[PDB]
Design an enzyme around this catalytic site. Structure first.
Site, short mmCIF file in Angstrom:
data_model
loop_
_atom_site.label_atom_id
_atom_site.label_comp_id
_atom_site.label_asym_id
_atom_site.label_seq_id
_atom_site.Cartn_x
_atom_site.Cartn_y
_atom_site.Cartn_z
N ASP A 131 0.86 -1.18 0.00
CA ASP A 131 0.00 0.00 0.00
C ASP A 131 0.90 1.23 0.00
O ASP A 131 1.69 1.43 0.93
CB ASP A 131 -0.94 -0.01 1.21
CG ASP A 131 -1.93 1.15 1.21
OD1 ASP A 131 -1.54 2.30 0.90
OD2 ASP A 131 -3.11 0.91 1.51
N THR A 173 -3.90 8.79 -1.20
CA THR A 173 -2.54 9.32 -1.25
C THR A 173 -1.80 8.88 -2.50
O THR A 173 -1.12 9.69 -3.14
CB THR A 173 -1.75 8.87 -0.02
OG1 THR A 173 -1.84 7.45 0.11
CG2 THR A 173 -2.29 9.53 1.23
N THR A 174 -1.93 7.61 -2.87
CA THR A 174 -1.25 7.12 -4.06
C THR A 174 -1.78 7.82 -5.31
O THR A 174 -1.00 8.29 -6.15
CB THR A 174 -1.45 5.60 -4.19
OG1 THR A 174 -2.85 5.30 -4.19
CG2 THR A 174 -0.80 4.89 -3.02
N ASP A 179 -12.62 -6.97 4.45
CA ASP A 179 -12.33 -6.06 3.35
C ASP A 179 -13.60 -5.71 2.57
O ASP A 179 -13.79 -4.55 2.17
CB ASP A 179 -11.28 -6.67 2.42
CG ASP A 179 -9.97 -6.96 3.13
OD1 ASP A 179 -9.65 -6.24 4.10
OD2 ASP A 179 -9.28 -7.91 2.72
#
Ligand SMILES: Nc1ncnc2c1ncn2[C@@H]1O[C@H](COP(=O)(O)OP(=O)(O)O)[C@@H](O)[C@H]1O
Lengths: 73, 509, 106, 516, 190, 502
Positions: free
Chosen positions: D42, D75-76, D379
């Site tokens: 991540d 963020t990515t 998830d």
């Protein structure tokens, strides 16, 4: 196929080539040259792994995952 | 730089190197080039084909690029530099893509498909603005020419060049012609006196006599052409045996001049009136012609000689004798007149009709040394307006129409080919970009204006060459013919695909 | 810069050429304000000079956009004292700087 | 090389974080110090951990961390979008485009892009999810499919999230994912799994002398534990009395008769009690009927308190039972059943009041695969929760970055100023997210980005194909999929802020000229 | 090699020509000494004579000296003035390129500058009285213009002979003459 | 060590030659010792210029030349396939297996391939008439060298070959010549019976019946053996006198030497235009601007022989023909010699195009087409190509390797992978990634369709059946291509050192 995976593979190949001869009943002896001047003899791969120097981070991570393997079994 | 991607990158870089030597030349008011190579002599030219011919293309990619570019022959329009720069910028816009590991054949397919769609689009949108029956097309040919030279001062002489170009339209009516475009440089006087004359005109005359003593209204003169000198005999010939025959020292050249007198009698009763030659003729011979109802027009360059021989339908001689044949033609009227500061010669009409010219005064060098290229191009413009059926807006207007059409049709294509079609359409933008840059005012702003003006509304907008901002190049009659631009774009695409589709250049020492 | 170029034209001595150089120096700040806007500096500065040479004695580059729009409303205004202080202090500083031949250590 | 020195550093950071953008991305070995080997895939974690050495990277990572602290996890997406914007802006500058024109371009592009997304690319949760959440969970399952199963688990989770719908203020009914009482179970036919309304505990089996075999009206909570021994609070041995040392527990047990009278008056017939209470102490309440249930743990305590409102420390403060018990810590519900299900006597508190929690029994043969399905279903619950957060959602899988690319490309030519070329360059730059998501799959980026962009152009140019607005790449695959009828979703707020912060980063780091 | 830097190199060559023509224009100009491979040495103020054999150092200087040479019959005195004026044009053109202007735009700016220069120059001064008949103010013109530079002393005769020679041939071609009919025969010995 | 060096050299040769393999092959620049520059995608020319100084490379190249001179197609297949053999043999030697085992395995695998490939064939050529069918059969070979404009060349070659292919079951390789007169448009090409030439001196054809040919590169005399007469260029008036003399000698030729076989004289050197006029008056034509190979072709196809220097003509070098007449094909004069099988067996086509480079491309296309027609006439069965046959062989060889216990199986499996390398060569050239397309092709091919291959037209790696698609190779072509490719591979592997001798 970036250079980092090639380095990972190269480190794995070097460490596996070092370890290969320790397999089987007829396993070879190995030479451990401690820069102090002495020599440590070994027949099996765990003993040589516990003190082999791995300056390449890929081989170092290989050693860590080998530690993860050997702590279980 | 051996195989595949690195070798292709090297080839496209060489293409860029050879393009930068010609990219600046593009445009009507192009920033021209200076070439020193060939004998150590300077030359100035504003033609991409010319600078590519005089420069030597050692590199294989550049070699085949210029070969295929000049194969379009760019005789009608400044198409050599356009083809070269379109090819080079196709390569430039595909450089990163072939660099990132893109197989060089799907890109060939992309170029072929994009070029086919662009050709279909041009043929679909090109307007057939040429009505055949109505003769007053002159009222738009004149506008087209005067706008092709709208940059220079045109108070009223615009009408004079307009009448010149249209009467030259009916004067070069038959076929594609090359002499017709040259205009005779004149020094001195005002620019008002500018009139058409048929046939040819000749350069500065020497101080030879007979300027008017033999009347210069030669009616049906038979034409003579020469390639062997008639010269003075000032150099001494030795005859020293005895002093009894002091006249023998000159009898040796008296015999030669008697032979030449027999030759001139042969010319005289052969009916030839005016003699043309590449080389200066001795003064004594000039007075022989002046006395014997004939005239000397020697030491003239070979371009006028081929001009006159194809005017008369004859051939060169490479001799002074054996001129008693139909090897030369018969002009209707020869006149020699003192125009401005120098005496010139004329052959109005000649026997055939593929030969005529025009007289250009103005008493300056600037506008007429410009003319030798600019009105060259401008009557070329009108020749494209006459002899090519369909036209499309020039000055990159069609390039923006393609940069919109091909780009949206790319964003329509599902496959990976669509990104390459988009790069193709982006590469089409160089023609307005470079044409604007050679006009000085910044290319980026004009390109943004062209982008925003397309995709909504009229399509004919392009760069206004005379001004800074944008305008309808079609409305300003700054056209490019449909068929010629199809050939130019297809040639550029073929050049690009031929450069991309080659691996290593191999040679055996 | 326009009016002072005219004044230098009317002026005599090397002082005239130097005052013309003063105007040519001062035209940097509109040029660099354009060069910090989207507009290219040279076209903007020549357009401003032409505008001031054709009446319209207040034209410049604003903050609400980048083009030359300072006839009214969106025009950016300052009290002159800031500008005249910039001139006076900068002129005194350049006077001092050229007033120097050498910098000596005690 | 005064601005390219910043652009290249940001591009290097993007290249480092790029290979891990999607769920299928590769692993990164990050070592901020010697020997501290870390392997995470991540990009947010590595960005928090990657020791940038260049001030441009410093500020870009600072803005990324600020975005993380503000909302979500994009963020990515922020880093790759911003750095691709920077690379393409430097390409524009090399083409003699002035930097602040590119600044105004990116600013207007971000504004118009946000407007476009908000006005015709958001799809609302009150319209979505009646059935589509099933296939969204299926897509979440696609990461860890362990056989033919997965469709029944999708119905399971969708019915749960409908049942565990956390009715709350602001009309935003999302539930906490940890609240649900997921339970692994062995010796079960693993391809079934039952869902039961109400929370569940680590129910006592094999020692229930207490007769919990019959239905109950209400449950009472207790985080105290009366004990003969000094294992928990309240019990002391320092007292100087041979009797009181023992009968403190007996006196407390007699006092707790008052507490069980209080719970009966409130409505409870069984009281649950944390670990450490004696079984003989349970007998005292079994005899009086208000029996006590042992072995409930801290997670059980927190679930009970947060679901039923059973705040044990609301009025009870000391370990003594003389204080007031009331509804403030009652297990408010309708009824509580203790039926033997699949050889386990689970305690289910039906229709838990003030939060209608539910219980999940994860049937599975072995410990490892039970934990794996627990992770995968957690998830899935998190992804459906994230969909439900904003009450409005946009198609994930890079459909937005692709669709928005075409609109920005078209809207560039809508305006004439120099900013429009920056608009276009931003439009083509924003496709880096589909490009990266494609690279992370074995399928090449060029072809799949081409197909995606062509589908989106079809949606933009052929108005009949308005349903085509939201085809994007499958995150866990290499094909373009209809990302509402199936596929993933990501909240509109988090990604619109991702684009906004990416543009603000690309402005703050591009307005730089030189370091002095 | 290419582009604006190559044009700057051309500008440096033009400055090499201009700075050496700088000291030569005007009556008080500093003469150059012309030496051929034979070693013959001669001093001269005439810019045309200086440029007649000024050898190339970089090519564009050769191009421009050929351009200046091509107008010797009409340009007259001030051909070195032409060269220094063009050199100043290029010297300030370098400043304009430093300011970032594309060369063709300063080029057409210079041509319109020449246009307005011509327009003002037509209005700059008055006309001398008649040429062919009176010739006396023309005698004064020829004195104050030609005999001031390098001749031992200005005196009426060379100017009077020159003006007589031209007026014998000036009027036929509508107030024009060609120098093909007028030549100089230099013969030392008197 | 030297084995690995030879393998590396042959690997790089096969790599630099591989890019031209397949219809969409990548061109390359060629700069021979004539320094002319042109782009081509033909293995024969690219190797003929490329100086393969490495002896192993020279061995493989001459094996390719032997394959080409025996059979038309597959000259690049030999290079790429031998390269695959050597790369996989290098892999086997890196494993540690000896050269003897790998070469013996390659030999037995080649024998198995030659044994099973006749079972692999799916169709056989019908009668060579019906220009459509023979065009469809040339389809693969014609498309292999040129792409984008392919059907026209197939029809052209089919018409040319069939118009001259005799009723007997024989056809000759040196049949179709090419004439490369420049001009716009490839589609303007056409075929003529007999030989044609591009352009020469003008003439009025009188030899339209009972045509006979003389050929002189020597002074334009042409006297009969019974008289003496010559032209010597030393002065003008007697030069005209001789011109009359040898024109009368040409008349004597067409009268009497015609019985031996001389009517029209072929001149190597240029002659005066006035002499051309005299030739026009006295009814003798002539041809000019012909290269020495052109004279050789014209004389051999009539039975004549070019004379280097002056010699009276004799029956030993006379030429026979049926007709010499003229046509303005492509709006340009071309001479034609027509036959009625007195010698015949020759047909010639005119090549049309705007560049000599495209002219040579058409030339190689024509050569490969006519050679394919050669190998089809004597072996009418022919194999489905386009990767289908190579992979069917690969699957069969893999099955054989699993069938063979012990050693020699490494070479069998790597020989099958060398088969596998061919559609990789198609894939890299066609813009599709090799691994995906080869795996999908196995997926569709192990099912037994047996005629699936690499679909070029698809932009995405995919497959189609080549039988109905018209992509299909010659049986004998692939048979000998693989045979000499394996022979070259086994011979080069049998060289453990490169040694020089004096
Ligand atoms: N239409 C086609 N599609 C796929 N492969 C083809 C096609 N045509 C030819 N080939 C391949 O190319 C081979 C022959 O062409 P090539 O080897 O490249 O040149 P050459 O015939 O001169 O040796 C054939 O054996 C076949 O494998």
């Amino acid at each position: 196929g970036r250079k980092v995976q090639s380095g990972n593979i190269n480190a794995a190949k070097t460490i596996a080539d070092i370890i290969r001869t320790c397999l089987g009943p007829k396993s070879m002896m190995k030479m451990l040259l401690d820069p102090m001047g002495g020599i440590v003899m070994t027949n099996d791969g765990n003993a040589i792994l516990r003190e082999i120097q791995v300056q390449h981070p890929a081989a170092k991570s290989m050693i860590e995952i080998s530690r993860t393997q050997d702590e279980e079994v | 730089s051996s195989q595949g991607i690195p070798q292709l990158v090297s080839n496209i870089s060489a293409c860029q190197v050879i393009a930068e030597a010609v990219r600046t030349t593009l445009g009507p008011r192009g920033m021209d080039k200076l070439i020193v190579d060939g004998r150590g002599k300077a030359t100035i030219s504003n033609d991409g084909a010319t600078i590519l011919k005089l420069l030597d293309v050692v590199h294989p990619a550049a070699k085949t690029l210029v070969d295929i570019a000049k194969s379009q022959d760019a005789e009608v329009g400044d198409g050599t530099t356009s083809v070269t720069l379109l090819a080079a910028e196709f390569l430039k816009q595909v450089k990163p893509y072939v660099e990132e590991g893109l197989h060089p054949q799907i890109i060939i397919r992309a170029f072929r498909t994009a070029t086919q769609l662009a050709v279909n689009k041009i043929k679909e949108i090109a307007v057939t603005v040429k009505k055949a029956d109505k003769v007053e097309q002159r009222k738009l040919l004149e506008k087209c020419a005067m706008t092709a030279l709208s940059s220079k001062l045109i108070s009223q002489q615009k009408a004079f060049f307009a009448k010149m170009v249209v009467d030259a339209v009916m004067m070069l009516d038959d076929l594609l012609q090359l002499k017709m475009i040259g205009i005779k440089k004149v020094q001195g006087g005002a620019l008002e006196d500018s009139q058409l004359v048929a046939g040819v005109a000749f350069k500065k005359t020497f101080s030879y006599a007979g300027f008017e003593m033999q009347p210069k209204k030669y009616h049906n003169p038979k034409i003579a052409l020469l390639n062997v000198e008639l010269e003075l005999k000032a150099e001494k010939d030795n005859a020293e045996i005895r002093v009894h025959t002091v006249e023998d020292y000159q009898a040796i050249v008296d015999a030669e001049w008697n032979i030449l007198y027999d030759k001139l009698e042969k010319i005289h009763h052969s009916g030839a009136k005016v003699v043309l030659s590449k080389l200066p003729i001795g003064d004594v011979a000039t007075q022989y012609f002046a006395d014997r109802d004939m005239f000397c027009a020697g030491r003239v360059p070979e371009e006028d000689l081929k001009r006159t021989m194809m005017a008369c339908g004859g051939s060169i001689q490479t001799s002074v004798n054996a001129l008693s044949a139909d090897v030369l033609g018969r002009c209707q009227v020869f006149e020699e007149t003192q125009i401005g500061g120098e005496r010139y010669n004329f052959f109005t009409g000649c026997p055939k009709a593929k030969t005529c010219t025009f007289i250009l005064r103005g008493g300056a060098e600037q506008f007429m040394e410009e003319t030798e290229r600019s009105l060259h191009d401008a009557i070329m413009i009108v020749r494209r307006a006459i002899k090519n059926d369909s036209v499309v807006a020039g000055g990159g207007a069609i390039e923006m129409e393609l940069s919109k059409y091909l780009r949206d049709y790319s964003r329509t294509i599902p496959g990976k080919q669509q990104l390459l079609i988009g790069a193709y359409a982006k590469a089409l933008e160089i023609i307005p970009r470079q044409l604007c840059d050679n006009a000085g005012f910044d290319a980026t702003n004009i390109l943004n204006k062209l982008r925003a003006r397309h995709a909504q509304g009229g399509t004919w907008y392009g760069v206004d060459i005379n001004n800074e901002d944008i305008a309808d190049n079609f409305e300003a009659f700054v056209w490019e013919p449909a068929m010629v631009r199809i050939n130019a774009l297809t040639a550029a695409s073929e050049a690009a695909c031929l450069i991309v589709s080659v691996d290593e250049t191999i040679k055996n020492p | 810069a326009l009016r002072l170029t005219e004044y230098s034209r009317t002026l005599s001595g090397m002082e005239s050429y130097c005052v013309r150089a003063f105007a040519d120096a001062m035209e940097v700040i509109p040029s660099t304000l354009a060069e910090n806007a989207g507009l290219n500096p040279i076209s903007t500065v020549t357009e401003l000079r032409n505008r001031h040479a054709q009446g319209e004695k207040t034209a410049g580059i604003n903050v609400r956009k980048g083009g030359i729009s300072n006839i009214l409303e969106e025009l950016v205004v300052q009290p002159l004292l800031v500008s005249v202080s910039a001139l006076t202090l900068a002129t005194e500083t350049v006077r001092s700087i050229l007033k120097i031949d050498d910098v000596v250590n005690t | 090389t005064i601005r390219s020195q910043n652009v290249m550093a940001a591009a290097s950071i993007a290249n480092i974080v790029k290979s891990s953008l999607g769920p299928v991305g590769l692993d990164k070995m990050l070592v901020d110090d010697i020997g501290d080997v870390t392997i995470t895939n991540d990009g947010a974690t590595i960005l928090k951990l990657l020791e940038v050495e260049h001030p441009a990277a410093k500020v870009l990572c600072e803005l990324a961390d600020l975005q993380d602290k503000e909302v979500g996890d994009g963020t990515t997406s922020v880093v790759i979008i911003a750095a691709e914007l920077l690379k393409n802006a430097d390409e524009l500058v090399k083409q003699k485009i002035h930097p602040t024109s590119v600044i105004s371009g990116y600013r207007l592009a971000c504004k118009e892009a946000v407007r476009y997304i908000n006005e015709n690319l958001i799809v609302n949760t009150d319209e979505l999810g009646r059935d589509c959440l099933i296939n969204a969970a299926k897509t979440s399952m696609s990461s860890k499919i362990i056989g033919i199963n997965g469709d029944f688990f999708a119905n399971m989770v969708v019915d749960a999230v409908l049942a565990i719908k956390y009715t709350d203020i602001r009309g935003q009914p999302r539930y906490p994912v940890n609240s649900v009482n997921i339970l692994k179970a062995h010796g079960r036919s693993q391809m079934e799994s039952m869902l039961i309304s109400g929370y569940a505990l680590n129910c006592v089996v094999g020692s229930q002398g207490m007769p919990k075999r019959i239905v109950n009206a209400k449950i009472a909570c207790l985080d105290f534990s009366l004990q003969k021994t000094k294992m928990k609070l309240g019990v002391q041995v320092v007292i100087t009395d041979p009797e009181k040392l023992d009968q403190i527990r007996q006196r407390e047990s007699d006092i707790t008769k008052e507490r069980i009278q209080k719970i009966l008056a409130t409505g409870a017939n069984v009281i649950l009690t944390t670990g450490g209470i004696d079984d003989m102490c349970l007998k005292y309440f079994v005899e009086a009927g208000a029996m006590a249930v042992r072995r409930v743990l801290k997670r059980d305590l927190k679930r009970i308190a947060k679901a039923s409102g059973a705040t044990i420390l609301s009025t009870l403060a000391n370990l003594e039972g003389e204080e007031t018990f009331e509804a403030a810590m009652l297990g408010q519900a309708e009824e509580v059943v203790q039926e033997r299900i699949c050889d386990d006597e689970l305690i289910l508190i039906k229709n838990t009041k003030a939060r209608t929690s539910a219980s999940i029994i994860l049937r599975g043969a072995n410990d490892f695969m039970c934990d794996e399905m627990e992770r995968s279903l957690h998830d899935a619950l998190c992804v459906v929760k994230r969909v439900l957060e904003s009450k409005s959602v946009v198609p994930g899988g890079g459909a937005v970055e692709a669709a928005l690319s075409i609109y920005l490309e078209n809207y560039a030519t809508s305006m004439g100023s120099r900013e429009q070329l920056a608009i276009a360059e931003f439009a083509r730059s924003l496709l880096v997210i589909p490009n990266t998501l494609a690279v992370n799959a074995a399928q090449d980026s060029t072809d799949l980005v081409a197909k995606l962009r062509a589908f989106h152009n079809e949606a933009q140019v052929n108005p009949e194909r308005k349903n085509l607005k939201w085809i994007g790449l499958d995150l866990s695959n290499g094909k373009p999929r209809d990302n509402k009828q199936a596929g993933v979703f990501e909240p509109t707020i988090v990604k619109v802020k991702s684009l906004k912060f990416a543009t603000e980063a690309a402005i703050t780091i591009l307005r730089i000229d030189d370091l002095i | 090699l290419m582009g604006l830097e190559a044009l700057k190199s051309h500008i440096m060559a033009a400055k090499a020509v201009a700075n050496t023509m700088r000291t030569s224009l005007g009556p008080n100009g500093l003469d150059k000494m012309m030496v051929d491979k034979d070693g013959d040495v001669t001093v001269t103020n005439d810019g045309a004579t200086i440029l007649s054999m000024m050898d190339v150092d970089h090519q564009i200087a050769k191009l421009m000296v050929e351009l200046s040479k091509s107008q010797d019959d009409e340009i007259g005195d001030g051909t070195t003035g032409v060269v220094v004026l063009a050199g100043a044009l290029l010297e300030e053109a370098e400043q304009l390129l430093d300011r970032g202007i594309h060369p063709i735009r300063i080029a057409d700016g210079y041509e319109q500058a020449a246009r307005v220069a011509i327009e003002h120059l037509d209005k700059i001064s008055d006309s001398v009285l008649v040429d062919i008949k009176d010739t006396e103010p023309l005698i004064q013109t020829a004195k104050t213009t030609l005999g001031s530079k390098v001749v031992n002393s200005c005196h009426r005769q060379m100017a009077e002979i020159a003006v007589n020679a031209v007026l014998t041939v000036a009027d036929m071609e509508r107030r024009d003459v060609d120098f093909e009919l007028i030549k100089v025969e230099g013969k030392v010995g008197g | 060590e030297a084995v690995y060096r030879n393998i590396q050299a042959c690997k790089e040769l096969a790599q630099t030659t591989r890019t031209a393999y397949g219809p969409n092959g990548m061109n390359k620049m060629v700069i021979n010792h004539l320094e002319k520059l042109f782009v081509t995608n033909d293995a024969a020319t690219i190797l003929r210029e490329l100086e393969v100084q490495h002896p192993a490379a020279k061995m493989i190249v001459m094996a390719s030349h032997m394959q080409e001179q025996e059979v038309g197609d597959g000259t690049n297949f030999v290079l790429v396939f031998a390269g695959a053999l050597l790369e996989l043999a290098e892999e086997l030697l890196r494993i540690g297996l000896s050269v003897s085992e790998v070469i013996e395995g390659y030999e037995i695998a080649c024998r198995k391939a030659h044994e099973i490939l006749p079972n692999l064939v799916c169709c056989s050529a019908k009668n060579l008439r019906d220009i459509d069918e023979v065009s469809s059969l040339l389809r693969t070979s014609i498309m292999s060298k040129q792409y984008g404009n392919e059907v026209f060349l197939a029809k052209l070659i089919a018409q040319a070959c069939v118009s001259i292919f005799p009723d007997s079951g024989h056809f000759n390789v040196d049949n179709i010549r090419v004439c490369k007169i420049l001009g716009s448009g490839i589609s303007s090409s056409s075929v003529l019976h007999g030989m044609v030439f591009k352009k020469e001196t003008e003439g009025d054809v009188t030899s339209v019946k009972d045509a006979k040919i003389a050929v002189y590169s020597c002074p334009f005399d042409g006297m009969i053996t019974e008289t003496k007469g010559t032209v010597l260029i030393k002065t003008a008036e007697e030069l005209m006198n001789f011109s009359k003399g040898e024109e009368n000698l040409m008349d004597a030729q067409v009268k009497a030497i015609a019985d031996t076989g001389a009517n029209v004289v072929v001149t190597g050197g240029k002659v005066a235009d006035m002499a051309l006029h005299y030739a026009n008056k006295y009814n003798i034509m002539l041809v000019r601007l012909n290269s020495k190979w052109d004279l050789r072709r014209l004389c051999k196809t009539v039975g004549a022989t070019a004379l280097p220097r002056l010699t009276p003509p004799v029956l030993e070098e006379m030429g026979h023909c049926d007709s010499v007449y003229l046509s303005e094909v492509g709006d340009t004069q071309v001479v034609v010699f027509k036959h009625e099988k007195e010698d015949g067996a020759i047909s010639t086509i005119v090549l049309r195009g705007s560049t000599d480079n495209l002219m040579d491309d058409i030339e190689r296309a024509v050569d490969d087409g006519v050679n394919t027609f050669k190998v089809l006439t004597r072996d009418k069965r022919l194999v489905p190509g386009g990767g289908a046959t190579e992979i069917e062989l690969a699957k069969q060889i893999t099955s054989y390797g699993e069938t063979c216990p012990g050693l020699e199986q490494y070479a069998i499996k790597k020989f099958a992978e060398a088969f596998e390398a061919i559609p990789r060569a198609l894939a890299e050239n066609s813009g599709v990634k090799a691994n995906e397309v080869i795996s999908k092709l196995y997926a569709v091919h192990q099912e037994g369709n047996k005629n699936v291959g690499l679909d070029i037209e698809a932009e995405v790696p995919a497959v189609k059946d080549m039988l109905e698609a018209g992509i299909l190779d010659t049986y004998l072509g692939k048979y000998w291509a693989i045979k000499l490719a394996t022979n070259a591979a086994v011979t080069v592997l049998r060289v453990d050192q490169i040694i020089m001798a004096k």
